[PDB]
Design an enzyme around this catalytic site. Structure first.
Site, mmCIF file in Angstrom:
data_model
loop_
_atom_site.group_PDB
_atom_site.id
_atom_site.type_symbol
_atom_site.label_atom_id
_atom_site.label_comp_id
_atom_site.label_asym_id
_atom_site.label_seq_id
_atom_site.Cartn_x
_atom_site.Cartn_y
_atom_site.Cartn_z
ATOM 1 C CG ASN A 178 -14.885 -46.568 -2.379
ATOM 2 O OD1 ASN A 178 -14.030 -46.876 -1.842
ATOM 3 N ND2 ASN A 178 -16.242 -46.557 -1.650
ATOM 4 C CG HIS A 216 -11.659 -46.002 2.472
ATOM 5 N ND1 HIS A 216 -11.175 -47.073 1.877
ATOM 6 C CD2 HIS A 216 -12.244 -45.657 1.302
ATOM 7 C CE1 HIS A 216 -11.541 -47.577 0.888
ATOM 8 N NE2 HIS A 216 -12.270 -46.774 0.326
ATOM 9 C CB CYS A 235 -8.484 -49.000 0.711
ATOM 10 S SG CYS A 235 -8.485 -48.609 2.402
#
Length: 317
Positions: free
Chosen positions: A282, A262, A92
């Protein structure tokens, strides 16, 4: 992995407690099958890592919209709408970067060039500089690599788009028909400096570099102004278990343990039913949350969302 018996991670109890809580978002089960391992390999960003040298700010009473959406503002930039998938890999830190970079290329070269930057190239060629590949990394260093060695094109898994499209299959959850099961077992592929066959120019010829890189100052107005004239940016926050349960509305942590860090892409802001929020992309595929996107409380440095934002301007000619 827990073979094939009692699947699904979070209890309906957590989903129900959050819903009984009556907050600004509603809970639902995003994950079934997935092993708890996979769920942690998903939060692959180390918070409090290295920061970029600079830090920009804005000292003029800019008149910014009440709400804003980079997708609307820049309809001619296809990548701004795209939602990518990191597979069973904590890349990520790399996704938030290549995504924001793809957007910025199109924005700053205003329309003539629109490319999907390879998250693959980054995940595999930065090295120890960026952290430990699929096991986690640092956003600041990803932009760094962009300034120094730059990145080549590369689309989604099996898309045949770009120089190096991602080689990690989508694990868009599972349930249905035993699709690639979401697992935590997954190595980092090697740094291969060769474009996929049937693609010109060459790897070092298909490279895109960035100017410098910087931090946006942990200020709601500052983070807003940056996106307004420069485009989406990379950010990172602390993922708590209930967040994996998101369906819609403005997320506000209420319960659960800290799963980890994240990184994500921030592309706008707005107010909903009285709650100010950030419009976030996301990277867990489009069958998660609100079509890959979600909203999180804005103006209170909620879960660190305003704390580690970084970006940079692109090369151009």
């Amino acid at each position: 992995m827990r073979s094939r018996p009692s699947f699904h991670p979070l209890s309906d109890e957590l989903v129900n407690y959050v819903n009984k809580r009556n907050t600004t978002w509603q809970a639902g089960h995003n994950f079934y099958n997935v092993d708890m391992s996979y769920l942690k390999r998903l939060c692959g960003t180390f918070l409090g890592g290295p920061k970029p040298p600079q830090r920009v700010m804005f000292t003029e009473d800019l008149k910014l919209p009440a709400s804003f959406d980079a997708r609307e503002q820049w309809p001619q930039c296809p990548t701004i709408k795209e939602i990518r998938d990191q597979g069973s890999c904590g890349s990520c830190w790399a996704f938030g970067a290549v995504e924001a970079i793809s957007d910025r290329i199109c924005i700053h070269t205003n329309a003539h060039v629109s490319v999907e930057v390879s998250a693959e190239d980054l995940l595999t060629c930065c090295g120890s500089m960026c952290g430990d590949g699929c096991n986690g990394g640092y956003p600041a260093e990803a932009w760094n690599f962009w300034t120094r060695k730059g990145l080549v094109s590369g689309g989604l898994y099996e898309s045949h788009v770009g120089c190096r499209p991602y080689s990690i299959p989508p694990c868009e959850h599972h349930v249905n028909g035993s699709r690639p099961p979401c697992t935590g077992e997954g190595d980092t592929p090697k740094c291969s400096k060769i474009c996929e066959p049937g693609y010109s120019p060459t790897y070092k010829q298909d490279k895109h570099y960035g100017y410098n890189s910087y931090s946006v100052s942990n200020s709601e107005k500052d983070i807003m102004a940056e996106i307004y004239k420069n485009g989406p940016v990379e950010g990172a926050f602390s993922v708590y278990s209930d967040f994996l349960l998101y369906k819609s509305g403005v997320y506000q942590h209420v319960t659960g343990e800290m799963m980890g860090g994240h990184a994500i892409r921030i592309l706008g802001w707005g107010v909903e039913n009285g709650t100010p929020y950030w419009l976030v992309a996301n990277s867990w595929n489009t069958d998660w949350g609100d079509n890959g996107f979600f909203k999180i409380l804005r103006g209170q440095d909620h879960c660190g969302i305003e704390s580690e934002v970084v970006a940079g301007i692109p090369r151009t000619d």
